[PDB]
């Protein structure tokens, strides 16, 4: 009953004998499977996540300047030296300024100057290598009566899924992605992660590290030296958001993981069975718990309450013609059951175009509902 209400819904019918169903699963889309002698199921691809990802490069987006040291030297004298010049944590720049009597020097000319400032990164962005081999596809299988979750990885594509009271199925899948992972990088910002190009990430003008220890390469990309004065580029958080406008995000930080692609599956319904196939036909009265409503695909959903004592039994439903003689419609929900006395059952029906009568129950005590389908 999961696919009921979902806009992007596809109905797939099995082979004449059954045993197997070929289907395509995608994010947002819901698939309803129907087979002879097998129960009606609802398949949906909930999440796709990259388990093992290797770190490539870590960039600095937010930085701050600390402990500024200026060393001045008069003309003819040697070049100024600082202990911070050899230290990797400090950024240093050499230049020459006009020195003389006004500057506090005996001789006139260009005097050597060196400025050193401590580089400290507060906000950092990581970029991990992504490949097709390490991808975990989560598929939810729900019966017509929240369901059962199953994991699919290219290493282990076929998975035996057990459905209590309904037996079990063999879910064999094949991951089909239209994006080249060799030219892509899984970039993470704070809690959110995006799927960006390999070259774009490597060509970013920000200070970077080869590892991930909690020394930055190319510190001048954020620190600017003036004619003495040091300036920081600020926070590049907003700068990335503008560039990430076209890029698709994997994790939103909340818990929703997704990847653009299709998961072609071949569900083996060999050992599947319908719960209550041996149940007798319900003799007691039936009453509508909720009024019958039409879905976006033309199918009708109705809730009925059992008033008899023959429970657990099979609900007798028939979609008859205008004169209520011959059955001219089919039931989507395979063999609906009334578990106990005063129990509500959800049923998905497929009425034909025009006037049709739905008979729920047995004899004269049976409930009759009139329905009209446009088109």
């Amino acid at each position: 009953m999961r696919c009921v209400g979902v806009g992007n819904r596809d109905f797939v019918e099995g082979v004449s004998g059954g045993a197997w169903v070929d289907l395509v699963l995608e994010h947002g889309g819901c698939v309803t499977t129907m087979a002879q002698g097998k129960p009606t199921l609802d398949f949906e691809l909930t999440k796709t996540t990259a388990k093992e990802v290797a770190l490539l490069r870590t960039y600095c987006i937010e930085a701050s300047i600390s402990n500024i040291t200026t060393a001045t030297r008069c003309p003819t004298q040697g070049e100024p030296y600082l202990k911070e010049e050899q230290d990797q944590q400090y950024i240093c720049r050499r230049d020459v300024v006009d020195r003389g009597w006004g500057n506090g020097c005996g001789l006139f000319g260009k005097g050597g100057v060196v400025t050193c400032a401590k580089f400290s990164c507060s906000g950092k962005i990581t970029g991990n290598l992504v490949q097709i081999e390490n991808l975990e596809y989560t598929v939810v299988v729900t019966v017509h009566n929240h369901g059962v979750t199953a994991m699919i990885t290219p290493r282990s594509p076929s998975v035996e899924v057990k459905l209590p009271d309904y037996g079990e199925l063999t879910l064999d899948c094949e991951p089909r992605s239209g994006i080249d992972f060799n030219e892509m990088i899984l970039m993470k910002m704070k809690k959110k992660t995006w799927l960006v190009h390999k070259q774009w990430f490597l060509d970013l003008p920000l200070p970077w590290t080869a590892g991930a220890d909690t020394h930055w390469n190319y510190k001048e990309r954020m620190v600017t030296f003036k004619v003495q004065d040091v300036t920081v580029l600020g926070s590049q958080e907003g700068a990335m958001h503008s560039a990430l406008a076209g890029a698709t995000e994997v994790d939103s930080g909340d818990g929703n993981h997704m990847f653009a692609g299709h998961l072609k599956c071949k569900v083996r319904m060999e050992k599947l069975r319908i719960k209550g196939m041996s149940y007798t036909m319900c003799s007691g009265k039936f009453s509508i718990d909720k009024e019958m409503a039409e879905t976006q695909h033309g199918t009708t959903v109705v809730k009925v309450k059992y008033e008899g004592a023959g429970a657990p039994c099979k609900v007798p439903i028939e979609i008859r013609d205008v004169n209520k003689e011959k059955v001219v419609g089919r039931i989507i929900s395979s063999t609906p059951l009334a578990e106990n006395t005063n129990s509500v059952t959800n049923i998905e029906l497929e009425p034909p175009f025009g006037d049709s009568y739905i008979v729920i129950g047995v004899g004269n005590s049976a409930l009759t509902l009139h329905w009209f389908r446009k088109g």
Epitope: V148, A150, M151, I152, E160, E168, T170, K271
Partner: antibody, heavy 123, light 108 residues
Framework: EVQLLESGPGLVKPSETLSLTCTVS????????WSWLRQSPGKGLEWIGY???????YYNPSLKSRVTISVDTSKNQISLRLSAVTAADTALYYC?????????????????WGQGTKVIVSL | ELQMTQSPSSLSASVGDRVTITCRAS??????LNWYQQKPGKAPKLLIY???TLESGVPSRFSGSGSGTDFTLTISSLQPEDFATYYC?????????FGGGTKVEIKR
């Protein structure tokens, strides 16, 4: 050759959470369905629930609200976690391989059984 | 709501005798039933799966019968190795429920 070894502790005070682990040796854990079962005089053999490496776990309605069973592929062990433990939970806990059809004899039939872990509930 | 009731609770018989263990179900479960053997201190051992099919290594004396509600476990010729507690379990509907148990003791 496939063996199932149960780890304790076999003594839990009432209201506290009971934790038991089942190690799978001489066979891959990621292929088969693993189930936990308990035995005590007056209750007999009671099926707690099953758990799979890729497929979601399912439990008995009598313990579902308190029990949690998970499969750890990296450690090759199945962890059983029963919360709000009472005097009625005093039983001999077994870990067994629940059959499917392709794996372990037949559908929902415990062929491979563990040694068993005695759990006593008292202050 | 499905209840598994097996009769009798305890059975006394000699070596060579033909024993009959009956397992009853409150609802129709078809051929979906399993038989187990349990000795004191040791873990249970599966003998008969799918109500009649015998497990590998289990002797010819053990036999499975029944379909729907009433089920039968029969040992044509009882042996000293066969003296243990016998259990029956269903797999048609969840949760998986086991029977009361039948202890087979030596007639003295």
């Amino acid at each position: 050759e496939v063996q199932l070894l149960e780890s304790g502790p076999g003594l839990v005070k009432p209201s506290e959470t009971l934790s038991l682990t089942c190690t799978v040796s001489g066979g891959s854990i990621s292929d088969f369905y693993w189930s936990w079962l308990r035995q005590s005089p007056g209750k007999g053999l009671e099926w707690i629930g099953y758990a799979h490496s890729r497929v979601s776990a399912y439990y008995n309605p009598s313990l579902k609200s308190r029990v949690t069973i998970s499969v750890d592929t990296s450690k090759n062990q199945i962890s059983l976690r029963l919360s709000a433990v009472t005097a009625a939970d005093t039983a001999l806990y077994y870990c067994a391989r629940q059959g499917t059809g392709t794996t372990g004899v037949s559908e929902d039939s415990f062929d491979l059984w563990g040694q068993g872990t005695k759990v006593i509930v008292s202050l | 709501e499905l209840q598994m009731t097996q009769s009798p609770s305890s059975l006394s018989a000699s070596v060579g005798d033909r024993v009959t263990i009956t397992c009853r179900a409150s609802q129709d479960i078809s051929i979906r039933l399993n038989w187990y053997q349990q000795k004191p201190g040791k873990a249970p051992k599966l003998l008969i799966y799918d109500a009649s099919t015998l497990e590998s290594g289990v002797p010819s004396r053990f036999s499975g019968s029944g379909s729907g509600t009433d089920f039968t476990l029969t040992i044509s010729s009882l042996q000293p190795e066969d003296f243990a507690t016998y259990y029956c379990q269903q797999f048609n509907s969840y949760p998986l429920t086991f029977g009361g148990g039948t202890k087979v003791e030596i007639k003295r």
